[PDB]
């Protein structure tokens, strides 16, 4: 008995939370093994992991199985509003266009799905970007503070206060441009490709199936991640200030001084994020099936 929007918001949020918490121990072990040398350097670890199974036996055996979900609450407080806004807005923009595959032509309908995905991504980003910046600032200040380094902020509000006072709204949305281009591509292909391919391939007994929905979302996230990766290279590279003027000069100078290949480097890692995203989409549809 709530609006059509708030329902999607809550469905997207819940589905995002379930998806993140589900894929949490795999990402935990992935990080643990990937960043073990830097831990030996900082004195956080004493000897390497002679295997993924040993990494499990080790961490879980000392502090319990729950140790696998360390740091997940922060990822859920980041991811919940992000995906909630994304899904609610996708269905809204989809209804704003309101294309019927049969009434308006398949290519125009798919363009409707892609446009909706992109628009929703851009809107969510506009709302959550400053929060991501502030949480990051506070976390880095906490690490420096942990090691005896001088503190800069009391809390999030202090981050907002100080950054607003020095650079204004631009300070909070620092490096927004390549961020919104990348997200309009990524969310466009994410929502657009999933919704456009789902009725085509998932027909008959697969119309209500979940494993099929997750696998389709898995492909979609894989491909979309790969397609949106160069804008992520330009984004990360431009926010590295914490060397280039405008994303177009960063693009041209990187392609000319490193190569086109350099932009794509680091693409393989997205593979686990690909699971999370995929799970959010499938769990969402399933969640709507039981709801309506």
């Amino acid at each position: 008995g709530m609006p059509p929007f708030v329902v999607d918001f809550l469905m997207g949020g819940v589905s995002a939370a379930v998806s993140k918490t589900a894929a949490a121990p795999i990402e935990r072990i992935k990080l643990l093994v990937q960043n073990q040398d830097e831990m030996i350097k900082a004195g956080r670890l004493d000897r390497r992991y002679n295997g993924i199974i040993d990494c499990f036996r080790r961490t879980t055996a000392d502090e319990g199985l729950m140790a696998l979900w360390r740091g997940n609450t922060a990822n859920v407080i980041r991811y919940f509003p992000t995906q909630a806004l994304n899904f609610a807005f996708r269905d809204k923009f989809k209804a704003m266009f309101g294309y019927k595959k049969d009434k308006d032509g398949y290519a125009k309908w798919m363009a409707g799905n892609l446009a909706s995905g992109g628009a929703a991504g851009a809107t969510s980003l506009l709302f959550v970007y400053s929060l991501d910046y502030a949480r990051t600032r506070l976390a880095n200040d906490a690490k420096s503070a942990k090691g005896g380094g001088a503190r800069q902020f009391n809390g999030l509000i202090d981050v907002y206060r100080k950054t607003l006072a020095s650079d204004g709204i631009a300070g909070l949305y620092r490096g927004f441009g390549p961020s919104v281009a990348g997200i309009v591509v990524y969310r466009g292909l994410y929502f657009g490709m999933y919704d456009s391919i789902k009725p085509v391939v998932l027909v008959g007994p697969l119309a209500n199936n979940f494993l099929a929905s997750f696998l389709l979302g898995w492909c979609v996230t894989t491909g979309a991640g790969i397609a949106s990766y160069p804008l992520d290279t330009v984004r990360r590279r431009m926010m590295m200030t914490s060397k280039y003027k405008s994303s177009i000069d960063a693009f041209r100078q990187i392609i000319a001084k490193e190569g086109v290949k350099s932009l794509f480097k680091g693409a393989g890692a997205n593979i686990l994020r690909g699971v999370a995203g995929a799970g959010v989409l499938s769990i969402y549809d399933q969640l709507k099936i039981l709801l309506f």
Epitope: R44, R47, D62
Partner: nanobody, 124 residues
Framework: QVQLVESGGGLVQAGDSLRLACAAS????????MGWFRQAPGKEREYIAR????????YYADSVKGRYTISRDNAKNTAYLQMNSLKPEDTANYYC?????????????????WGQGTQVTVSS
């Protein structure tokens, strides 16, 4: 129950060499990383070195690189620290620590058991 008792160390001339011992009682020694630290009055404590439980890998600090050499004996349950080419600034109370092998800790100063330390004074 578990005690870390520092052995060796006294007053020595500059440039001479010392060996400090660390006797660990009450625990499985063949499974604990041993660490060496020092504390001098007016100076914040600093981590010297660390050695794995099986005596496979050793790690040092930039301040005592190549000068100090850490080792251990599981048959005697002792950790050794060899101090060479000493300078007057090395004058400190050297203490010993121990922690389980392969547990992730917040940093260098996070250990299970701590010793009380042996005074080391370097004359000029």
């Amino acid at each position: 129950q578990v005690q870390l008792v520092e052995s060796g160390g006294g007053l020595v001339q500059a440039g001479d060499s010392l060996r400090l011992a660390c006797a660990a009682s009450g625990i499985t020694f063949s499974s604990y990383t041993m660490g060496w630290f020092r504390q001098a009055p007016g100076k914040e404590r600093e981590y010297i070195a660390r050695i794995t439980g099986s005596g496979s890998n050793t790690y040092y600090a930039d301040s005592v690189k190549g000068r100090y050499t850490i080792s251990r004996d599981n048959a005697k349950n002792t950790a050794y620290l060899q101090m060479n080419s000493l300078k007057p600034e090395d004058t400190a109370n050297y203490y010993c620590a121990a922690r389980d092998d392969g547990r992730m800790y917040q940093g260098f100063y996070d250990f299970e058991y701590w010793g009380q330390g042996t005074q080391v004074t370097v004359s000029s």
